[PDB]
Amino acid sequence: SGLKIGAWVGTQPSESAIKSFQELQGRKLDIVHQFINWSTDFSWVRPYADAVYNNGSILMITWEPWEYNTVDIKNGKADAYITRMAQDMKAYGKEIWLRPLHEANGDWYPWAIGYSSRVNTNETYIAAFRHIVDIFRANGATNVKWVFNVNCDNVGNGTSYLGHYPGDNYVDYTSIDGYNWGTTQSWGSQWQSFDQVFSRAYQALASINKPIIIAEFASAEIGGNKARWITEAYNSIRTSYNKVIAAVWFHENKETDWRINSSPEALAAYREAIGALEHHHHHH
């Protein structure tokens, strides 16, 4: 097995939070996920990065530009902030997976192509993403790996899996986010298997010669059997999604109970599923 296992552990990934989640799933994390905005300096990330790297994991950062849309970023309005982040990440030196401008084929983020301001187009998005990558490269931050992302579904006008793809020269990994909402959402959500959630986006990304990360996935309990969903998800990943190199759960219970331990059955299924994956002994 090469498949790496990751999580957002429900809170910022302090040493204690990482340990708690590892105790729960019964396995060391390969990847730990954290979310920041474009007001966050790397000095704030620093203590969390140290916890993740000390643990023997890679940090995946989703870097959310609430502060700057794709026009602002492509035009250079954020460049001082970008430059400092690049400099700080270069100096830190460890491998970091960075996911800027994510889910841009939805309509809920102000940088997304589907967003109703109509400011973001394929062209502004591509220019923005390339501009970020260029600044990081100019500052030597080759330890930062670039993660392109799509939502499992295209939501909003003008959205597509690949129209905003910035090119192989600017991308190290592609990625998908997707959730089985079960029957939990009033807008009429339905139970969907992992394959139902992810297949379409995977088919699209599989046409690009980059490895694929399932950067966020989880299932609700309501409307079906979440334990079976988990078992089937990992089996699908192994058998039918062989370009996927990492699976990163979204473990949280603020609204929908996405947690791996939303019930005893789900937890047992999760532990059993990841236990099929080869043990990777870690040492620094």
Side-chain angles (χ1 to χ4, degrees):
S1 304
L3 184 73
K4 295 176 204 286
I5 297 301
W8 162 256
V9 303
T11 187
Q12 311 291 1
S14 62
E15 176 183 348
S16 55
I18 293 168
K19 284 176 179 171
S20 188
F21 187 81
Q22 296 178 340
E23 288 157 32
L24 188 62
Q25 74 164 12
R27 191 187 177 91
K28 194 174 113 15
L29 287 164
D30 304 303
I31 298 156
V32 185
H33 193 187
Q34 185 174 36
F35 300 83
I36 65 172
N37 60 24
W38 282 45
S39 297
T40 301
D41 251 29
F42 187 79
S43 60
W44 182 91
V45 179
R46 209 165 286 115
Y48 298 110
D50 289 342
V52 171
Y53 292 98
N54 285 345
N55 188 64
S57 304
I58 292 162
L59 184 63
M60 184 171 68
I61 299 172
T62 294
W63 190 26
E64 297 182 40
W66 289 86
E67 297 84 348
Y68 309 99
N69 63 41
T70 60
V71 171
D72 298 326
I73 296 167
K74 83 183 185 68
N75 285 346
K77 300 299 287 300
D79 287 3
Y81 171 74
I82 301 169
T83 298
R84 174 165 70 264
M85 187 63 73
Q87 288 165 340
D88 289 339
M89 286 185 171
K90 183 260 183 187
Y92 192 63
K94 305 285 195 280
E95 181 173 346
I96 293 165
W97 292 4
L98 191 54
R99 197 168 73 127
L101 294 157
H102 85 294
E103 293 177 10
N105 65 323
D107 72 347
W108 45 85
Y109 294 135
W111 59 85
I113 284 93
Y115 188 74
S116 60
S117 69
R118 298 279 183 244
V119 171
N120 309 298
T121 67
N122 290 336
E123 289 74 25
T124 65
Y125 184 97
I126 290 164
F129 197 112
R130 291 184 179 183
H131 193 56
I132 298 165
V133 173
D134 282 348
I135 293 169
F136 274 66
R137 292 173 176 169
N139 286 277
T142 53
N143 54 307
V144 178
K145 309 300 176 188
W146 297 106
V147 184
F148 175 76
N149 176 255
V150 298
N151 190 241
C152 57
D153 304 319
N154 301 128
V155 186
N157 301 288
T159 55
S160 73
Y161 296 127
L162 306 175
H164 65 301
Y165 182 66
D168 284 1
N169 290 328
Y170 295 93
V171 173
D172 294 296
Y173 297 95
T174 62
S175 73
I176 318 166
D177 296 352
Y179 293 74
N180 171 34
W181 299 90
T183 55
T184 66
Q185 303 298 284
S186 51
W187 54 258
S189 62
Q190 306 176 264
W191 194 272
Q192 308 168 275
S193 66
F194 179 95
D195 198 41
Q196 285 167 332
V197 175
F198 290 93
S199 108
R200 286 155 298 124
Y202 181 81
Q203 274 292 262
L205 293 184
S207 73
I208 302 296
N209 190 22
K210 298 288 174 175
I212 306 177
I213 300 164
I214 304 296
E216 300 178 23
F217 77 129
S219 178
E221 292 275 355
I222 302 291
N225 177 346
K226 176 172 175 173
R228 179 178 130 223
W229 192 98
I230 289 163
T231 302
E232 290 185 5
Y234 275 101
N235 285 336
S236 297
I237 291 171
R238 157 176 65 75
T239 68
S240 304
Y241 294 69
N242 63 26
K243 289 182 49 66
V244 167
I245 61 75
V248 185
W249 194 268
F250 187 79
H251 182 255
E252 181 161 284
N253 185 29
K254 287 183 196 317
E255 213 186 307
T256 303
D257 194 352
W258 300 120
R259 292 181 299 152
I260 66 169
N261 65 334
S262 55
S263 61
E265 109 231 357
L267 177 60
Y270 200 87
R271 289 169 58 89
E272 176 71 15
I274 68 182
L277 303 174
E278 188 173 326
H279 171 72
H280 305 294
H281 174 74
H282 185 260
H283 189 98
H284 284 112

